[PDB]
Amino acid sequence: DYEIQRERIELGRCIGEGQFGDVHQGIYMSPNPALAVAIKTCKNCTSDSVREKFLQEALTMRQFDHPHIVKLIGVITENPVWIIMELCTLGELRSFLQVRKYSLDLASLILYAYQLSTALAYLESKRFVHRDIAARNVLVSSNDCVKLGDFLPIKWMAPESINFRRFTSASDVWMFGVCMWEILMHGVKPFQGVKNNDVIGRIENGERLPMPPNCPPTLYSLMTKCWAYDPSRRPRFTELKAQLSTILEEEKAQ
Numbered sequence: 264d265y266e267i268q269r270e271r272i273e274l275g276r277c278i279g280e281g282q283f284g285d286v287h288q289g290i291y292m293s294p295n296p297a298l299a300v301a302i303k304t305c306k307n308c309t310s311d312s313v314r315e316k317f318l319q320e321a322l323t324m325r326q327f328d329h330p331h332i333v334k335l336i337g338v339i340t341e342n343p344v345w346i347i348m349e350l351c352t353l354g355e356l357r358s359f360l361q362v363r364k365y366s367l368d369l370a371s372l373i374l375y376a377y378q379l380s381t382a383l384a385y386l387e388s389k390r391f392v393h394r395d396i397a398a399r400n401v402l403v404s405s406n407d408c409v410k411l412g413d414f415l416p417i418k419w420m421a422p423e424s425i426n427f428r429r430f431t432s433a434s435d436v437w438m439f440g441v442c443m444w445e446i447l448m449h450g451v452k453p454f455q456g457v458k459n460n461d462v463i464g465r466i467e468n469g470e471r472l473p474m475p476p477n478c479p480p481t482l483y484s485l486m487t488k489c490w491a492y493d494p495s496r497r498p499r500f501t502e503l504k505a506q507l508s509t510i511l512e513e514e515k516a517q
């Protein structure tokens with residue numbers, strides 16, 4: 264159904280490293296003659312136990328269809344086993360933001376947050392809990408378009424996830440707060456120089472990540488709402504989407 268004949272794929276250069284092996288860009292020739300694609304490879308998929316786990320990412324991704332979630336294009340299930348995805352040409356978000364620290368305007372940063380919130384409101388409506396929302400798992404398709412990729416990170420995790428391994432859409436909202444902070448910090452990691460074991464203590468003392476330089480206070484406020492200790496007091500993703508739209512439109516008007 265989405266099994267792709269290997270001769271329709273031209274493997275190109277290695278563009279990254281994955282859990283199971285190198286990621287390449289490539290070209291997919293279909294009945295579009297030259298579609299740019301990402302190809303996830305798997306070093307040890309000659310073993311079926313590894314193959315089953317590798318190909319699970321594809322099965323998971325197949326269930327989603329959203330403009331801000333990376334699309335599965337297809338798979339090749341014989342050795343070498345590949346997963347074919349749309350290429351996000353500008354690569355990982357953190358690296359992208361770091362090199363454009365002084366060249367992306369604030370409206371673009373807010374747009375990325377908004378776009379991610381639309382993907383996450385979609386996932387919440389599908390009753391899908393992500394568990395790992397972080398800038399490391401976001402890819403850049405174009406200067407005006409980011410997409411959620413992936414499918415313990417203590418410094419991103421909600422207190423209930425840390426303490427009791429509770430994961431819900433409300434814990435995803437906490438993580439998304441941290442991801443928004445990362446974006447407005449131009450790809451700096453949260454709690455740099457702080458030991459993982461000490462994170463929950465700071466949180467429990469009422470401390471939170473600080474307002475990023477040049478971040479609109481309305482937007483930092485929204486981040487802080489994501490970091491309510493009580494998950495029931497956090498906004499739902501649809502509310503974040505609504506508020507981010509307003510913040511975005513206000514910034515576009517500057």
Ligand SMILES: CN1c2ccc(-c3ccc(C(=O)N4CCC(CCO)CC4)cc3)cc2-c2[nH]ncc2S1(=O)=O
Nearest residue numbers: 278279286301303348349350351352353354355359412
């Ligand atoms: C994790 N995945 C990826 C990892 C790296 C890159 C990636 C890395 C580097 C580049 C790249 O060539 N550059 C060079 C130019 C840079 C622009 C300057 O900011 C962007 C990085 C492009 C894509 C793309 C993907 C990807 N796209 N679609 C699905 C996936 S993935 O396999 O899930």
